[PDB]
Symmetry: C2
Subunit: 455 residues, 2 copies
Amino acid sequence: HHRALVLAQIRKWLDKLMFKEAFECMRKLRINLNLIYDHNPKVFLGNVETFIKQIDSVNHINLFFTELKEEDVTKTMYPAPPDGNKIDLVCDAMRAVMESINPHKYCLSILTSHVKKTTPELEIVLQKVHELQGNAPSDPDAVSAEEALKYLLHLVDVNELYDHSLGTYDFDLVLMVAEKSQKEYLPFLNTLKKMETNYQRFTIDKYLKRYEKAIGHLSKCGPEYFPECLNLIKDKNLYNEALKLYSPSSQQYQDISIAYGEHLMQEHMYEPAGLMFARCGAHEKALSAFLTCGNWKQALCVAAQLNFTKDQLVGLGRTLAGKLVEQRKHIDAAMVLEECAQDYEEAVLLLLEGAAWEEALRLVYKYNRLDIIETNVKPSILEAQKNYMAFLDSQTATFVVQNTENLKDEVYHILKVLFLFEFDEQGRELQKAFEDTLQLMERSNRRTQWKLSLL
Amino acid sequence: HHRALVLAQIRKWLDKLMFKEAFECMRKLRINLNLIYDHNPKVFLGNVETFIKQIDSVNHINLFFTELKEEDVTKTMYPAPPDGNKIDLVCDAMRAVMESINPHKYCLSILTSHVKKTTPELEIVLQKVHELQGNAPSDPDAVSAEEALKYLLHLVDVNELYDHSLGTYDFDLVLMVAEKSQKEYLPFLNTLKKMETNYQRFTIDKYLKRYEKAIGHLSKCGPEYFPECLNLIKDKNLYNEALKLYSPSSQQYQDISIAYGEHLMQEHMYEPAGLMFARCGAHEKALSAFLTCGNWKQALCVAAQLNFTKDQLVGLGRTLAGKLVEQRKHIDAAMVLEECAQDYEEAVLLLLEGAAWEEALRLVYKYNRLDIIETNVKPSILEAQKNYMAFLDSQTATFVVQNTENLKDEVYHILKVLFLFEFDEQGRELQKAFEDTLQLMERSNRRTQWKLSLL
């Protein structure tokens, strides 16, 4: 009972926005500092200004930062009868208030609110410690690039604080960190200095594994470096970000576009590669990329961009109809056959293979081939008939989620051609049949019509 | 407590399949007879044979029938700590046992199990009382058509028992009912007798409102009666059942088919009418029926069955493309325009109107009209772009069931033509945009891909 009396107090203090009283006492009985947020997140955010202002101190408001955990201490350590990420909301919201009130007094704390994010923003923290090199000192009123290094050192690995210096490119800043911490690193700098401005920065970023940026340099230190650069891209997969670098219509932006074709190819994402080849004017490549997947619409555009003869098109049409057949895209294969090669007969058989009765039939009359009705169309209907019945045992008796309400359309369609051809018996059979096996599904769909009043 | 002791007994008797003990006692304290089924339906059905056999009596097993209600007396009157319709299961199951054991002893009861169904089968009951006229008497061992009328009279309205006599067509049976019950009905019979066999039965069925059967007669009493008959059909809507009457290829089956066309027309079910006209060889009618709805596939078949000129087809194609446009079926309207009238330009604009970018574009190259890309295609893409963004505020902020996962396809499709045309900015914009407004929907879909690695 000795303890619960204190925590009571603290919960009432934080309730009356008295953060100092609460905090001063928490720190003296070593109670965890998260309480003062976790006790009520919606209130603490929305009163950050009056929080910051009550612990003016920078030791105190940094001691809060180090102690701040992702987890709610109200669930576990101090049991009690948001927007998103906690560490981030608090580091952000707190920093915006410190930014406003006095960026110069709170420098060391604003840096700490970058280092402590769920993904420490050390890139940003060092662009800030760099600016402290220029425009300093303005009296002991501000903080020097060295007073901040002493402090950051307690919070950031030394190998990681050094690796990030180099990121800024400012060498005096880079020395500052090695000397005010961990002289067999002087070889790197002393050869680095002897590189031209642009290629020096490339080597630094390729070394820090920052490839997207390291390309942003090699693109500037000359055209005899384009091959060394093209390599990086090829196998760091920097295709997207390298295109925005060189001007379009450049013979350099051209090679990067082809290599992106070739990489997309070798990755079995064939359609994107066909679109890239086709944009950068590589028609012969885009045609065999569009062929390998079943994109005939595009395939025929690229083919016109190459001026195929009426025959070379007939030949192409066939090749595609094959690729589409082996992708079970029968209706599509038929429509490339009747468009490109005027193969009336093959098209009609493929339409029937994909249960396109009405279109299978339009073609028959468009060509005086009424003989096929007997040979192929009526037999193909009657056989589908059976495969549709046999499927309503197979899927009725033998039955989680049954979307057999999407052959709702397909039955509608075959019912009409059944009636047109005097097959009433099997018509009424399927009508009745599909009806029951469709309502006989109510336990614990849509209103779209497929019936034929004619049966 | 005086009562619950008895009901206890009865529940234990019915439990030990002792129906007689139970029943004998139920009838003496006027307990409701439903108890002996409602106490356990799954058991009583499955022991009907031993039930029937224990009340051999026919008074007793008829007294059960009259007392049998649809409702469970176990829920209400006698509270207790199936397949379908109760009255029907019991009347059926009980009748099948009485049929087997001795159709002649149980005649009066088998008739009662027809009269008591949820929809009393009086048609069937009278075909049975008719058969008792022929093959009688075979001693007092059976029941005469008159001994059954005395009994049925207690159970069936007299006007309804008479109306059904006439249904059997046997006049001696018909007299039997009027005399052994309610002589100013003799005019009907005495003129009815003077009709030929077939037309006499027509008049009886038209009088009993049994039209489907009354047509089955008029179709036989001559060809000068076809007009009187055709009328009945027209306005009793007996089109389906009248077709199975006359032989196909009959000029009588022809007129019934047209009138069914005309009736389907006047009912705004235009597609069925177009199929009927088209089956019975009424092409000119089926063409304007297929036109009025948007069925161009069929429309073009019927048109070939009439040998339209190359021009009369161009003209038809246009007419359909209009009907399809006013049914917002843009892609279809375009495909009738490029097929029937070779209107390249109109088709391309309509495809764009229905967001068929890839097919809109195939056409452009199939005709050297690259100028349209500028004038019409690129502008139409960019505008869709906006209507797709503006729709992701309109449908994201302003939001039960949101199937905005079916424009999943349509975005995929427009993304590719965006990239082909150097519109990366609006590409990445829509990619990013649609992505969030698609995941930002998780609270309390599919895995189909629409992304472009190229953005």
